[PDB]
Homo-oligomer: A and B are copies of this chain.
Amino acid sequence: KTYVDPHTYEDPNQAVLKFTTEIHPSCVTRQKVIGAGEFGEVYKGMLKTKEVPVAIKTLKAGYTEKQRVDFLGEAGIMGQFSHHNIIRLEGVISKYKPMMIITEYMENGALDKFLREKDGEFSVLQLVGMLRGIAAGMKYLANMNYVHRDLAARNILVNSNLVCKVSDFGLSRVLEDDPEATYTTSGGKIPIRWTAPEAISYRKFTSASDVWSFGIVMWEVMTYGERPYWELSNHEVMKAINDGFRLPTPMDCPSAIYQLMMQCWQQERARRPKFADIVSILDKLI
């Protein structure tokens, strides 16, 4: 089995039919708002199937056709995957309004926010375990020939047992354009700070460029959610990186872990480890 790009059908319902389960709206109840996303509100609710807690993404009325395509495209991508460290798609409501994407609920939310909330409270082994889980998910994706393009701690979700799962499967994504962003970068866009040099310059996204992003995720984890490159503008970030600058070792980070970050940030992508190497390396440490 291998990844299929839902765009190839030129009908978003195709990937939905092929890779998702249609859920009847009588089985879904929303209980609270847990966020705002690109397409509309995001809720926590319950899915009757027995009932299970779920995250519920909705498509706000008045959407464009491109939005409708991108919305269903997210489900058409996620539904192709089945792995412990990849957010599980429960299903979609496509045949009623508003349309919904129903995924497994993750109690602790996004990883960057979670580690900030819990700054300093974990052991190295716990942090490494979070990184191993992310890497296992990315290994599964790379073997499916899926390149994520937008791997960052804000796109990893954390459950009550601290299991980390890759989320945010966007059909659409393009690189942000802003030369600055000293505090915050764009919306819907891939941030320059997490993206490999060849992906920025040559638009060359491969699993090796996901590895670069994973290195940045390692640094976010080991720093408890520090912003990569602090308040440097994107202009200065790219200049420094191409001159050989790499983020310094986080406080209390084992040298073996920082060395793996540095391997992930090899300027020349062929010299970076693959996700399989990373999982093995992190397994030895655990």
Contact = CB atoms under 8 A, between A and B. Distances in A.
Interface of A: 7, 10, 64-66, 69, 172, 174, 177, 179, 188, 197-198, 200-204, 235, 238-239, 242
B65 A201 contact: yes
A152 to B, nearest CB: 20
B203 A7 contact: yes
A interface, over-half SS: helix
Given A174-B174, A177-B188, A188-B177, A64 B239 contact: yes
A202 B8 CA distance: 8
What are the 4 closest A-B residue pairs judged by CB atoms, nearest first?
A7-B202, A69-B201, A172-B203, A66-B201
A235 B197 CA distance: 34
Contact of A10 (B10, B198, B235): B198
Contacts of A200: 65-66
B202 A64 contact: no
A64 B7 contact: no
Contacts of A174: 174
A178 to B, nearest CB: 12
Contacts of A242: 65
**Candidate in A64, A202, A235 with the most chain B CB atoms within 10 angstroms:** A202
Nearest to A268: B10
Contacts of A179: 64
Contacts of A65: 197, 200-201, 238-239, 242
Nearest to A62: B235
A177 B188 CA distance: 10
Nearest to A241: B65
A197 B172 CA distance: 15
